[PDB]
């Protein structure tokens, strides 16, 4: 008598990596790399219009 | 982080850590300038409330506030202080011989009169003189004593027990065979708890004192089952005898000893490996 | 594997989670049949020639 | 008398006379009245050849 | 932690090894402080005293002088436990598994109760070595003190059975709704008597010489429940105080002895701490780092020290 | 230390920036232990539960619930506060701010309720974001348990009037408890919540056993041992209460459970468990009022 068990498939999924630019709402943002912003607490953004 | 230190500048009228050892259960002297007022209350007026004012006033006469408030009653100092009180002779006169030769016994006789008087006016010596530590160093001058006497639980005897084996390190002497009531006669292998027990009895032996240590692998909440037993002093009739605070843990059951080496032949116990879990007092009935 | 999304507030932090599940074969054995008549064997063995 | 799991004498006078004379000087004689659970705690002599 | 290893003795059945795999985070009552222990001293056979096993009051009496510890890791030969009463000195915050019908809170003190509900049996079976392991039920301390007071008065009903045989239940608990059923089976005499004695003892010491001054204010409360909303909910409907009104007596020893101030502290010391003498002491406090405000029934809770 | 960072809200006034600087060392009760915390969650308006600002009863429930935290360093836009109850025993020495009693070399302080003194003392109120910080009072356990029984006694004399209880002399302190002018009208009205519990659970405690012991000891070892201790001590007041007052098992047994839980809550609400300990080193060990004290974790 010959008896055995076996494994048949190890299916995994790939993690879907997206960057933020690839979406459609990348229009509405102006993403600027602005470091040390929390080190100031004074809310002053002014520009001439 | 298993390391701590204390340091307090007190006087040498009490403990005098020169004649004491490196191992010394330094208790405090909590609030000496107190108790004309709370000695008046917490008692019926038929308790003669001026007694702690006078007897401690004799004790301060036996030697103003000074630049050091009166602290550090040793565990050595209490054994003679109730030596005539507990029912044990010729094992209590040796520690009193250690004090009247190396520490003035007038400071004992004025203090034992206070010990009767504290329980007389119902202001007990527990909730007074909380535990302080283990006396690492004594850098004492002529009048002062600036003792490093680390509080704060388990490490205080391991930091004076890891380097203990070479030369003479702490060893934590119990300092009396009559004291250290090593319990679990019906006992087996386990890590035991150390406690600091003061028993009381009103007007039996006239507000009696007994100062000693118990060792048990029993909880502080289950100790009152045993502390209600093992005594004949359950016959006050008010109440609140048999106070105890947890000294902490002895996690080496074999390491209890019996010896007689000090200074005068003083019978003593080596206690190897102590957790000084400082605990609190617990006195209701 | 599942992706996660940072937030800012009392809504908690998001650990990356996984599932790692397994399934088990169930087996059926399905049958066909056919017969041969009694005088049809003796043609095939060669007994009836 | 190291271990009793048998009922004692009725007469308390006989119950102590047949003990204090027996446990007088046996070195298997316990040096206290027995506790309820546990050993008898046989004495140690000072030394042994 | 003082990690305590519990030796798994002999063979092991292939489901019996998985029995320990689902107990990581339960509570072991171990009757010592060991660094090495065998498993039979933990089990419910070791709860069994001389002749009988304890009832639901005597189990607490067994649990009182027996030290709780929590399973931290699960190995097939050892169960590494951490003794809460001693080894809770953690920056590691040992976890606890809720085994109850109850969501606790974030921050409630938690004490242990024997299995006393109808569906929370929790007694595991080991066919290799015949041991039963009734795991205790970690519950919030307002809930546990609301349990233990039910069993004591039901045991006093087991003392004297005057009235005819239609008694109220004392078998119904409410916690945010949720009509919970207890197990009312058998009441052992000594487990009642040891619990009955301490309750009668502690309430006598709660009456001092200045206590009867508070008894003067009984008609003062019944005027307030007639004109205040806080008092009306405070004097409940099934209260003996509302039946009690259906007394100063100066007698002053010294006339300055603070008569109220001794009657409060002594009541606070004696009948206030009835939860420490009937049940176990609280030592478990729920401390969730990630901002979970609740701990679901069947979930894990990181645990820090005394309330 | 796992010091959780309390976030300041967006820009405040310059006196509000300086006011939070002098809170460096007060006691702060954080509800959860997230490493990011707002400041409105810290403030006393977050203690509003029953639609009202709570009394000292409602504070002691909340103080027995959430987790203590000592402010370590006050930063721009951040408060760095390490909590007490995290960490192993006696690790992480840090500073408390003293309040009028001495706080000696030991003594195990209790972060207890602010209205035990003058009512709007220490109530740091930011005018910009319009919130309120009521910092609690760090007193030692025998001085804690004394005073919290001392004030509930005073309300009884005001609950139905006709010695001054409020003396309480300490080792060097003549403790002026009486703020007679405007606070005793406002401190007595806040223990209205805590007094009526303390009256009830005594009167529900005494009158239960005054009708228990006549209905018990009449149907073993309970009768032998309990009367062995109460020989002419409680029996002397048994004949005294039953005569100088008034005198049903099923109302009684249903009232046995109801008192014991309510009496059990006051053991957790009152009695003021030691949160932290003082244990000093290289220090004078007798702390002035308003002086920093080294304070370490577990009792």
From Swiss-Prot, chain A:
Superkingdom classification of source: Viruses
Cysteine pairings via disulfide bonds: none
Compartments it resides in: Virion; Host nucleus
Family per record: Belongs to the herpesviridae major capsid protein family.
Function: Self-assembles to form an icosahedral capsid with a T=16 symmetry, about 200 nm in diameter, and consisting of 150 hexons and 12 pentons (total of 162 capsomers). Hexons form the edges and faces of the capsid and are each composed of six MCP molecules. In contrast, one penton is found at each of the 12 vertices. Eleven of the pentons are MCP pentamers, while the last vertex is occupied by the portal complex.
Quaternary structure note: Homomultimer. Makes the hexons and eleven out of twelve pentons. Interacts with triplex proteins 1/TRX1 and 2/TRX2; adjacent capsomers are linked together in groups of three by triplexes, heterotrimeric complexes composed of one molecule of TRX1 and two molecules of TRX2. Interacts with scaffold protein; this interaction allows efficient MCP transport to the host nucleus. Interacts with capsid vertex component 2/CVC2. Interacts with the small capsomere-interacting protein/SCP.
Protein name (record): Major capsid protein
